[PDB]
A = this chain, B = another copy of it.
């Protein structure tokens, strides 16, 4: 089912999970195990990421199909970096010919475009709509704290708006650790005339180091209390997992009481954190 329709039909929240194409047999087995655990929560959709320059193209397709084989509804990510327009179009056709009806149109990271490539995710959005109309549902990235490369936050929101207007049905946010970042962004988007659902992206912390590297790359901020607490227990993995889960639970309880349309979980191909968050919220069907 197209996410655009799920969002209107379902009055309770959509839970989604994000996974990446593992790069070796061991990784693949780990993801299969993670899938077997998380599918019992009956996610509204499951995303499969795409290597920035087209490096995972085959594996992304194969995992999209595998998600379908489990009875789950894939959201297929697709990037424009490092690919001709024709390459991007070919991969897109292969997703669509597989029965994938949900795409997440992204730029990807290296930034100079491919000589016959696109420059912006909005050009892929426009491609998809030009070729497939409403036969698919298209999402894009949003950055509550602003994309690192944007000259200003005003330009960031304007650029996001242009992307929406290319034909987005929904957006998924970059990770954030204080719900104020999300609600702020949401209000600013609405003031800018944007009406599409915008789903909060949540990463439950399972490792101090990982938190540090992720926020460093993507530009997200960490609350001072959370940082201190993680820093103290950084050497006790069980404590860290506990602290991350508690924090995501606090985050997600408020998002749901506020009426968000769904929550997208960055799982990093592991089940425990996401499982614990959902079980603590009373959300195991």
Chain A residues with a Cβ under 8 A of chain B = 144-146, 148, 152-154, 177-181, 183-185, 187-188, 191, 212, 214-225, 227-228, 254, 257-258
Contact = CB atoms under 8 A, between A and B. Distances in A.
A159 to B, nearest CB: 14
Contact of A188 (B183, B218, B227): B183
A222 B224 contact: yes
Contact of A219 (B146, B153, B217, B223): B223
Identical copies in the complex: 2
Given A146-B178, A153-B180, A184-B185, A220 B224 contact: yes
A178 B254 contact: no
A258 B220 contact: no
23 contacts: A145-B178, A145-B181, A146-B179, A146-B180, A152-B257, A153-B183, A178-B221, A180-B181, A180-B185, A181-B221, A183-B184, A183-B188, A184-B187, A187-B187, A187-B188, A215-B224, A215-B227, A216-B225, A216-B228, A219-B223, A219-B224, A221-B224, A222-B224
A178 B143 CA distance: 12
A98 to B, nearest CB: 36
Main secondary structure of the interface of A (DSSP, over half): helix
Nearest to A214: B224
Given A184-B185, A216-B224, 8 more contacts: A145-B180, A153-B254, A180-B184, A191-B191, A212-B227, A215-B225, A218-B224, A222-B222
Contacts of A146: 178-180
A146 B180 CA distance: 7
A184 to B, nearest CB: 2
A228 B221 CA distance: 11
A233 to B, nearest CB: 14
Nearest to A223: B221
